Specification:
Four copies of one chain form a homotetramer. Chain A has a single domain (1-290), classed as TIM Barrel. In chain A, 42% of the residues lie in helices and 14% in strands. The longest helix of chain A is centred in the N-terminal third of the chain and has 24 residues, at 28-51. In chain A, strands 1, 2, 3, 8 and 9 form a five-stranded parallel sheet that branches. A four-stranded mixed sheet of chain A has the order 4-5-7-6. Chain A has eleven helices and nine strands. Chain A has helices at 14-20, 28-51, 62-67, 69-76, 97-115, 132-138, 200-203, 218-235, 247-250, 253-266, 277-287, and strands spanning 3-11, 57-59, 81-83, 121-122, 144-145, 156-160, 184-190, 238-245, 272-274. The interface between A and C is large, with 46 and 48 residues. The structure holds zinc ion (4 copies). One zinc ion binds at residues 11, 13, 17, 85, 89, 125 of chain A. Chains A, B, C, D: One of its GO terms (molecular function) is metal ion binding. Chains A, B, C, D: It catalyses: Deacetylation of xylans and xylo-oligosaccharides. Chains A, B, C, D: Homotetramer.
């Protein structure tokens, strides 16, 4: 009795990512790559998912929602779940609590008008926080997050109020020689993010980022994702194995192929169940309450 | 009835690239690499193309035209198409509309005196824009561009006048929470650029660029280009598959070899037709007008 | 009669690394990755070591000691050696001699209260010095270091007092055209660090570091470690082959697997003896005194 | 009748490289890696060369000469050629003509006192120029250089006096829209440098360099060097194939192995002749004068 819950979470960065994270603000050429993600990328992923009768979760920035209305329709009509992901993919930590709350508000209503239901799930743009737990909870609806990394392949409840001492070399060592102090567990369930299961850093060329990659090969990345599944399957009876992808990157033919190899491999395993993130949270909320 | 139009577009960066893009301005050693591209690199590619009875398009910067006159003759005499690519490979977006127009003017007359005909095609240096659509059209001749990335393996007509709201954290979220607004379709046909089909970023060492690579292997890159062909061939009946290369990089023995494997692989496929970019634009203009 | 002493040295950077070296100070998301290292990472490595009845040395920052008390207990109870590694993983060279001495003091007493014995070994955070030899010696206990790189696969005694002339282009060449002047041999034994046998640089994504990697594949790294063993085994009769790893990186399923291949390979060789660093120093102190 | 002249040029950066190029000035830990290059690195390469009865050329910085006197003796006694490479590996282009001349003077006399003869060959540290042609010639002895990149696998005579127009966006396009103007051929013969045949950039980790690599695998690099040999052998009857290496990197067991594969491969080819750089210049001076 092995139950491995595997899922694809699709972050639709498209133009919003270049506006909010990736330095493409003033680059007609980058913005053009954003338009590819929405207009050409979204449909290719939907083709991929349908070919394998797969469900999925789309974390769609408001901007992407209002900029690719025809593709948004295509996603809702497939029965896929829609989660929040900012408006212009702004890093939550560079905003005021007001700015960040106005963005969260705006995203909620965008997704409600589009789908009928309010979104249950959230992904922080570029994967930041600050006091997002507070708002995801305050801002109702939000049942789970997929931005944090306290864990690997098991969900968990997010503690709010963790604290730590930064180093200050203008002071004496005892002033900062203190441990991190864990806060208190909340009801926000975390389906963890993982840099090792994210297609974008390794495979998207970002000219303005000193840390850019983009020419790591789909085959080395494909193999690494499989390696992680193999271990997890071997060492766990209950695990959730979620993959973060973007149409910006994963709708490119060479990585489209990569996913076909990943999907076919996973489907050779028994106990595997493809789901959406909301179904992972629901199951976890039942699997162990409090 | 599968028609896959595949083409090699050769950007002759040589010395111009180091002067305009790659930080080699004050580096005798870099400039020396530029002289290799023109004097030794150009002939090696011509040898490659002739061995496989391949046509090709060369996007030659003015500077390269006036600096390698003997090699320019070798290219014209092979019957290859010549497109524009700046003078000293200056990024269009750092120029005034006047500077950029004087460069365009100068390039046009350089290519006309060299070939007899004015150039029909253009590639923006390092792949920028600004209001280049306007000028490529205004500046007559220009029938197509190969700098933008709204699409993959299908050409398209370039809309001018797209607009978007940048993020300003000095303002309130509603001030920038707006979609991108598409402009209006022009007659400039785009045969799209693609970082995943460009030899330079992965394989040229650029000391002054924090984002430099240069030691990614021709074999991982070769494989990635093939992977893209394989998918495109499998999933499309009409597609254009163009590769951007530079004598600076692709005339190096280890990547010369890489292309022989790529070319031999493509030639095993039926429906494949090697062409020049101008022939791709002509066919597209007919394949679907307006 | 071949004696190859091979060891795993585990640097528990966890949260301390993000606080002291890796720029994660103000990143809830990074700090969350630090918590993974301690809470989830430490136990996984212990599982790995136990599966192969391997001993090991853990270089635990004070911060990690006071932040993961339950996991610290799990390590001591396995019989593994505990060495120093700062408090908040602060780079020794950015501290005053007082700051650096207070950190050393504090680490010593932390490790003594936890284990009963004072630590014999030390690893400089991020691998710096300054006048650490002086203090490792002064601060008693410290019998060996694993931060320096004068050598490969043979330990040695650390000279204190080496000097060299820096270049100053405001002066005349003869002012800095002088050799490095070796100081005098101390009793501090060095079991050498090696970037080619460190899991973190190649495989941890560090957003704030221009020099970040993180998407190099475990299989290419695995192969490189093996390659080094193979040569050493082939060319030496007495050598010490130590690997630096972090729960932050090596407790990730894809590199967990990498180690199983490394361990199984090494165990196919005769003359190989798995030990702790303290046992390597003891043996070396006897193997050749002075 | 195929004559392929292949050679190993060893740049002994050791401590000088960290002092002059690689940012290791204030890093005891880096300097320690420099000491490895000289003390442990030099002998390992000599072992490599002797195993295959190979000749070689060592470009030794003055600093390295005066810092590793025992290893210098080992090199001279093997019959290997010694060329110049600065004192503290200072980039020629950051110096005054006086500073650069004093360094050249000092290097000449260092190498003369050590070997008896003055050096015939030179490599610019980190591969710069400025008006080095003038001095290599003026400063007598110097018959050849191995810093420039006008060509691949054929030597050539260095033109002095090349000029080009830099871009200035404060001016009008016509002010810089001019070609490069070739100067006049000198007698300095160039045995060309090549980033694609240099072990250091891909495989040495340099913390202070944003462009650092260091975890590219010896096997991908090994294969790339071989690929270049294979093409050159296939396409040329007379070529010189020289490899630039450093004890800092190539004396590391995993790349030591890489070279054994490279050497064994080259030795399977007929027409191949292992030589020193001086022998390559002598042959070229005769092969075609003027
Ligand atoms: Zn995103
Ligand atoms: Zn170009
Ligand atoms: Zn550490
Ligand atoms: Zn050097």
């Amino acid at each position: 009795a092995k139950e491995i819950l595997v899922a694809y979470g699709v972050d639709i960065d498209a133009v919003a990512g270049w506006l909010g994270s990736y330095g493409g603000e003033d680059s007609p050429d980058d913005i053009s790559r954003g338009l590819f993600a929405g207009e050409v990328g979204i449909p290719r992923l939907l083709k991929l998912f349908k070919k394998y009768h797969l469900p999925a979760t789309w974390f769609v920035p408001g901007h992407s929602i209002e900029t690719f209305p025809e593709q948004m329709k295509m996603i809702v009509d497939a029965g896929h779940e829609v989660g929040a992901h900012g408006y212009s993919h702004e890093n939550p930590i560079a905003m005021s609590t007001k700015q960040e709350e106005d963005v969260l508000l705006k995203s909620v209503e965008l997704i409600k008008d589009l789908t009928g239901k309010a979104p249950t799930g959230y992904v922080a743009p570029w994967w930041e926080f600050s006091n997002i737990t507070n708002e995801l909870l305050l801002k109702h609806g939000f049942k789970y997050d997929h931005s944090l990394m306290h864990n690997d392949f098991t969900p968990y409840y997010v503690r709010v109020g963790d604290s730590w001492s930064k180093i200050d070399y203008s002071l004496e060592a005892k002033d900062w020689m203190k441990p991190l102090i864990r806060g208190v567990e909340t009801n926000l369930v975390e389906i963890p993010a993982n840099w090792y299961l994210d297609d974008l850093p390794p495979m998207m060329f970002i000219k303005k980022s000193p840390n850019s990659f983009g020419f790591v090969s789909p085959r080395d990345i494909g193999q690494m994702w499989i390696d992680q599944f193999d271990w997890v399957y071997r060492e766990m009876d209950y695990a959730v194995f979620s993959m973060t992808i973007h149409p910006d990157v994963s709708a490119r033919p060479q990585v489209l192929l990569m996913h076909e190899k990943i999907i076919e491999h996973i489907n050779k395993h028994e106990g595997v169940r493809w789901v959406t993130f909301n179904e992972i949270a629901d199951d976890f909320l039942k699997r162990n309450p409090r």
